[PDB]
Structure 1
């Protein structure tokens, strides 16, 4: 398909986010590259407004599922690439158990040769001494399953999944995710059978970077359909 072809090689990525969490206003800029052939991306994020007012891990899912590796037998289920280059709207509600929630709206599309993720994030009802505003989450990331289903009335998809954030005491902060994607343009899109994405992430720091930042290495493979 047209959109699939745009991902056969290494594609530069830009991420831009404006956020407001409990009245704390912030912005983040990210850059790196993806290669969907291997389900791989690498990104570095900088908080351009000073200190990030929430833990970096809480924003990983918000900061390009078009870089997932879809096995060849599953390529007919790849909504994300099929929407390109015009792209898709990705909306989420992220519910932090016993704490606040993020509501996000992003547009993912090409600008020239570059894959861009532009996001607005709103967080409400966080506790001042919860794990988010209290900065009690460890700087690391677990491996998850993202469950995808078609949304035929919107010519898009939905997804549901549970992110587990390690807390520095040994406990876990659950972040339930609900997601909806809808196409921006008027090209044909692929409406998938039920499947999931298997994710893994590693978070690091650039030892030469003094601004508040996060380096992400991420791999994602579509699964849950045999052969």
Structure 2
């Protein structure tokens, strides 16, 4: 579908969180069929961010999911034209974010482009996000489900951002995934398990960090 075992990618995110504007760019290398990716981000406007970077992590691609042969891979089937997705983030302390992403494969470059718009508000000044008290998202299991009359998928995952003191901070992710062309095949409902990690790489020059994700699709374990 215009894809190879190893690919590069590019990222552009513009956002506003609690009224703070920012632009982030980045690049990475991934293995679409192994569901693995490693990416490096740099805050080119609005740095240093007054809020935890961890809230942005999921806003930077389900092409990078190891799918078994007997589950339709809606995301690779959408390539190379690609797909768009929209996601709401509902945090336990009343904060709300929305992210929209447009994904396109460049077959000429073997490179997957990502353009994001990220908007969020109502993070309490004294909460773990504005106080930068977060460390990493916990590993998760997302439910993926088809909307057959519409040729789109929905995702549903209850997420936990782990805190410096050892506590957890919950966020409900609800996602709509939409191929750019009408799919011939639709998957049945299944799960995707994720593990996403951040490592800071900031220095005198820029705020920057590395994200790594490993994702695998699974059917229900029950016969």
Partners of 2:193 and 2:163 in 1: CA distance? 22
Partners of 1:172 and 1:135 in 2: CA distance? 14
Partners of 2:35 and 2:130 in 1: CA distance? 32
Match of 2:207 in 1: 212
Match of 2:112 in 1: 115
For normalisation by structure 2, the TM-score amounts to: 0.90
Partners of 2:204 and 2:142 in 1: CA distance? 32
Match of 1:137 in 2: 134
Partners of 1:203 and 1:195 in 2: CA distance? 26
Match of 1:160 in 2: 156
Counterpart among 6, 16, 21 of residue 20 in structure 1: 16
Query: Which one has the bigger helix percentage?
Result: 1
Aligned: 1:67 with 2:64: yes
1:141-152 alignment to 2 at 5 Å? 141-152=137-148
Partners of 1:161 and 1:45 in 2: CA distance? 24
* Superposed CA offset, 1:167-221 (max 9, x none): 22221111110000112235x3532111011111232234778411111121111
The DSSP-based 3-state class of the residue aligned with 2:90 is strand
Partners of 2:165 and 2:191 in 1: CA distance? 31
* Structure 2, unaligned runs of 5 or more: none
Counterpart among 175, 183, 193 of residue 179 in structure 2: 183
Superposed displacement of residue 99, structure 1: 3.0
Match of 1:169 in 2: 165
For normalisation by structure 1, the TM-score amounts to: 0.89
Equivalent residues of 1:154, 1:182 under 8 A apart: no
Partners of 1:201 and 1:125 in 2: CA distance? 25
Partners of 2:10 and 2:4 in 1: CA distance? 18
User: Which consecutive aligned stretches of 4+ in structure 1 deviate over 6 angstroms post-superposition?
Assistant: none
